[PDB]
C-alpha cells in the first residue's frame, strides 16, 4: 500500500 492504515 502507498500509505499505512490500509488494513
Amino acid at each position, epitope marked *: 500500500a502507498g*500509505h499505512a492504515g490500509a488494513g
Partner: antibody
Amino acid sequence: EVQLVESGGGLVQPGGSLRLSCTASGFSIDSYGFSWVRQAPGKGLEHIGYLTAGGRAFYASWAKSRSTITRNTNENTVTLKMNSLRAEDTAVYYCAKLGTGSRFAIWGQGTLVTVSS
Amino acid sequence: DIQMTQSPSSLSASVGDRVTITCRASQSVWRNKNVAWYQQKPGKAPKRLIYAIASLYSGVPSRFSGSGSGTDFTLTISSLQPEDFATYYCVGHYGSENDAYYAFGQGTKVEIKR
C-alpha cells in the same frame, strides 16, 4: 483545476466546538486519504488526524478524545469536528492530502479558529 | 512519540548560495519512502517541493533536490533565489497496516541576505 476549498473558522468560546469542511473539486474525496493539520500562531505544523481512503480515521493521541474526521461522498467533502475547545486550540486549521509518497498533494487554504471568551 | 528534527532551525544566505537542510526521524518512514519537503510562506498553506524523498513534482524549480534514506533526509537548494525565503518543513508518514501517523519537522526558517 483541482481544488480543496475550506470553509468554517472564526471565534469560538472556550468549551465550544469547531466544525470545518473542505470541498473537493476535480477528484473524489473517497479515492484518497486526507489529513487535518493545524498551526498555532508563530508555531510549527501539527498533525491532527488522517482519514484513509478505506474510511478509517487515525487521530493523534492528543486529539482523539475530542476530534472526529468524516467524509460525505455525495457532497464530496471532508469535515473536522472538535469539541471542548481551549485557548490553546487557537490556530490555523488546514485540510490536506500530504503526498509524502505519491504524486497527488493538495491543501485547503487554511482558516483561523480563535478560542476566547 | 515520533520526532523529526531539522538542522539548522534557521539560517541566512545570499542569492546564489548553496543551502542544505537536514532532517532526522526517530524511526523509519512508511516503506522507507514517504517523506516530503514543504515550503511555507507566513500565513499561507505550505507548498510541496519534494515527495518520496527525492522526486521533484512538475513545475517545482530544478534548484530544489531531495535525498536521503529511511531516517535521514536532506533538502538542497543549489542556488538560492530571493523568492526562496520561507519556512521549510520535512513531513514523514509512519505506521503499519492498522496504524497511521504523520509527523512534521519543527521547521527551518530561511532568510535572504543582501
